[PDB]
Amino acid sequence: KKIFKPEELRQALMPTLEALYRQDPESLPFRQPVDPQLLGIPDYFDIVKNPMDLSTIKRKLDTGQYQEPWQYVDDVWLMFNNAWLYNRKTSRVYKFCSKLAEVFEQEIDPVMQSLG
Ligand SMILES: Cc1cc(N2CCOCC2)cc2[nH]c(-c3c(NC[C@@H](O)c4cccc(Cl)c4)cc[nH]c3=O)nc12
Numbered sequence: 001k002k003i004f005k006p007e008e009l010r011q012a013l014m015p016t017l018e019a020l021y022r023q024d025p026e027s028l029p030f031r032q033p034v035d036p037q038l039l040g041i042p043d044y045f046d047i048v049k050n051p052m053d054l055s056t057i058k059r060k061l062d063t064g065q066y067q068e069p070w071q072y073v074d075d076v077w078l079m080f081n082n083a084w085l086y087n088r089k090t091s092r093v094y095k096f097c098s099k100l101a102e103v104f105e106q107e108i109d110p111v112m113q114s115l116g
Contacts, residue, residue, distance in 0.1 A: 001116060002068070002115075003047035003068060004048075004064070004067070004068050004115070006063075006064030006065075007112075008062075008115075009061065009064075009068075009115075010062065011019070011067050012069070012114070012115055013061055013069060013072055013111060014061060015107070015111070016104065016107040016111055017054070017057065017058060017061060017110050019103050019104070020054060020076075020100050020103060020104060021054060021097075021101060023096075023100055023103060025096075026096040026097075026099040026100055027054065027096075027100060028096075029083070029093050029096060029097075029098065030053055030054050030056075030079060030083070030097075031053065031054050031055060032053060032055050033053050033055065033056065034048075034051055034053065035050060036110045038047065038087055038102070041086070043088060046097055047083060047085060047086050048082045048086055050078060050082075051082065051092070052075050052078045052079040053079055054084060056075070057072065057075045057076060057079070060072070060075070069112060069115050070112075073108060074097055074105055076108075078102065080097050080104075082103045083096075084097055084098075092096070
Protein backbone atom coordinates (compact mmCIF):
# COMPACT_ATOMS: atom_id res chain seq x y z
CA LYS A 1 0.00 0.00 0.00
CA LYS A 2 1.27 3.44 -1.03
CA ILE A 3 1.83 5.84 1.85
CA PHE A 4 1.25 9.43 0.74
CA LYS A 5 2.72 12.24 2.78
CA PRO A 6 0.40 15.28 2.84
CA GLU A 7 3.25 17.34 1.39
CA GLU A 8 3.54 14.95 -1.57
CA LEU A 9 -0.18 15.22 -2.38
CA ARG A 10 -0.06 19.00 -1.96
CA GLN A 11 2.81 19.59 -4.39
CA ALA A 12 1.64 17.01 -6.96
CA LEU A 13 -2.03 18.05 -7.08
CA MET A 14 -1.89 21.83 -6.59
CA PRO A 15 -1.14 22.54 -10.29
CA THR A 16 -4.31 20.66 -11.30
CA LEU A 17 -6.27 22.78 -8.82
CA GLU A 18 -4.69 25.99 -10.16
CA ALA A 19 -5.78 24.91 -13.64
CA LEU A 20 -9.41 24.97 -12.48
CA TYR A 21 -9.13 28.30 -10.62
CA ARG A 22 -7.49 30.11 -13.52
CA GLN A 23 -10.49 29.55 -15.82
CA ASP A 24 -12.19 32.95 -15.97
CA PRO A 25 -15.20 33.32 -15.95
CA GLU A 26 -15.90 29.60 -15.72
CA SER A 27 -14.44 28.99 -12.24
CA LEU A 28 -16.19 31.86 -10.43
CA PRO A 29 -19.38 29.92 -9.44
CA PHE A 30 -17.10 27.26 -7.91
CA ARG A 31 -14.63 29.35 -5.90
CA GLN A 32 -16.60 29.54 -2.62
CA PRO A 33 -19.31 27.36 -1.00
CA VAL A 34 -22.66 27.84 -2.69
CA ASP A 35 -24.69 30.36 -0.67
CA PRO A 36 -28.35 29.58 -1.55
CA GLN A 37 -29.81 32.74 0.00
CA LEU A 38 -27.31 35.14 -1.59
CA LEU A 39 -27.76 33.44 -4.98
CA GLY A 40 -31.55 33.25 -4.70
CA ILE A 41 -31.73 29.49 -5.24
CA PRO A 42 -33.28 28.33 -1.94
CA ASP A 43 -34.00 24.79 -3.16
CA TYR A 44 -30.26 24.19 -3.74
CA PHE A 45 -29.78 21.97 -0.69
CA ASP A 46 -33.11 20.27 -1.43
CA ILE A 47 -31.35 18.94 -4.52
CA VAL A 48 -27.63 18.82 -3.61
CA LYS A 49 -27.05 16.63 -0.57
CA ASN A 50 -23.25 17.02 -0.23
CA PRO A 51 -21.94 20.44 -1.23
CA MET A 52 -18.36 20.86 -2.44
CA ASP A 53 -16.37 23.73 -3.93
CA LEU A 54 -12.83 24.78 -4.83
CA SER A 55 -12.12 26.58 -1.53
CA THR A 56 -12.93 23.44 0.46
CA ILE A 57 -10.84 21.25 -1.84
CA LYS A 58 -7.98 23.76 -1.64
CA ARG A 59 -8.08 23.85 2.17
CA LYS A 60 -7.98 20.05 2.44
CA LEU A 61 -5.00 19.88 0.07
CA ASP A 62 -3.18 22.81 1.73
CA THR A 63 -3.67 21.59 5.32
CA GLY A 64 -3.17 17.87 4.72
CA GLN A 65 -6.66 16.40 5.10
CA TYR A 66 -6.48 13.81 2.28
CA GLN A 67 -5.31 10.31 3.16
CA GLU A 68 -4.80 9.31 -0.50
CA PRO A 69 -5.09 11.16 -3.83
CA TRP A 70 -8.28 9.58 -5.13
CA GLN A 71 -10.16 11.37 -2.33
CA TYR A 72 -9.11 14.62 -4.03
CA VAL A 73 -10.41 13.25 -7.32
CA ASP A 74 -13.63 12.27 -5.48
CA ASP A 75 -14.14 15.82 -4.16
CA VAL A 76 -13.55 17.43 -7.55
CA TRP A 77 -16.12 15.22 -9.31
CA LEU A 78 -18.61 15.69 -6.46
CA MET A 79 -18.31 19.45 -7.08
CA PHE A 80 -18.88 19.05 -10.82
CA ASN A 81 -21.71 16.54 -10.38
CA ASN A 82 -23.47 18.91 -7.95
CA ALA A 83 -23.38 21.65 -10.60
CA TRP A 84 -24.49 19.32 -13.40
CA LEU A 85 -27.42 18.17 -11.21
CA TYR A 86 -28.69 21.55 -10.04
CA ASN A 87 -28.25 23.49 -13.30
CA ARG A 88 -30.08 22.86 -16.58
CA LYS A 89 -28.03 21.14 -19.27
CA THR A 90 -27.68 24.18 -21.54
CA SER A 91 -27.33 26.84 -18.86
CA ARG A 92 -24.24 28.98 -18.38
CA VAL A 93 -23.18 27.36 -15.10
CA TYR A 94 -23.68 23.88 -16.55
CA LYS A 95 -21.40 24.84 -19.45
CA PHE A 96 -18.92 26.46 -17.05
CA CYS A 97 -18.78 23.23 -15.09
CA SER A 98 -18.22 21.23 -18.29
CA LYS A 99 -15.29 23.50 -19.16
CA LEU A 100 -13.69 22.98 -15.75
CA ALA A 101 -14.31 19.24 -16.06
CA GLU A 102 -12.60 19.10 -19.47
CA VAL A 103 -9.58 20.87 -18.03
CA PHE A 104 -9.50 18.54 -15.02
CA GLU A 105 -9.83 15.27 -16.92
CA GLN A 106 -6.85 16.31 -18.99
CA GLU A 107 -4.61 17.56 -16.19
CA ILE A 108 -5.30 14.90 -13.59
CA ASP A 109 -4.40 11.80 -15.63
CA PRO A 110 -0.59 12.22 -15.90
CA VAL A 111 -0.42 13.47 -12.29
CA MET A 112 -2.20 10.40 -10.92
CA GLN A 113 0.07 8.15 -13.00
CA SER A 114 3.18 9.73 -11.49
CA LEU A 115 1.80 9.41 -7.95
CA GLY A 116 1.24 5.65 -8.25
C1 LIG B 1 -14.56 12.40 -17.53
C2 LIG B 1 -15.95 12.70 -17.14
C3 LIG B 1 -16.84 13.39 -17.98
C4 LIG B 1 -18.20 13.70 -17.61
N1 LIG B 1 -19.10 14.42 -18.50
C5 LIG B 1 -18.75 14.80 -19.89
C6 LIG B 1 -19.94 15.03 -20.81
O1 LIG B 1 -20.81 15.98 -20.25
C7 LIG B 1 -21.33 15.57 -19.02
C8 LIG B 1 -20.19 15.34 -18.02
C9 LIG B 1 -18.69 13.28 -16.36
C10 LIG B 1 -17.77 12.56 -15.50
N2 LIG B 1 -17.98 12.02 -14.21
C11 LIG B 1 -16.79 11.43 -13.81
C12 LIG B 1 -16.51 10.78 -12.52
C13 LIG B 1 -15.29 10.25 -12.12
N3 LIG B 1 -14.22 10.28 -13.01
C14 LIG B 1 -12.85 9.89 -12.85
C15 LIG B 1 -11.87 10.25 -14.00
O2 LIG B 1 -11.50 11.60 -13.74
C16 LIG B 1 -10.66 9.32 -13.90
C17 LIG B 1 -10.83 7.90 -13.97
C18 LIG B 1 -9.72 7.04 -13.88
C19 LIG B 1 -8.43 7.55 -13.70
C20 LIG B 1 -8.30 8.94 -13.62
CL1 LIG B 1 -6.74 9.60 -13.41
C21 LIG B 1 -9.38 9.82 -13.72
C22 LIG B 1 -15.17 9.65 -10.79
C23 LIG B 1 -16.22 9.62 -9.91
N4 LIG B 1 -17.47 10.16 -10.28
C24 LIG B 1 -17.54 10.73 -11.57
O3 LIG B 1 -18.71 11.18 -11.80
N5 LIG B 1 -15.91 11.61 -14.83
C25 LIG B 1 -16.46 12.28 -15.89
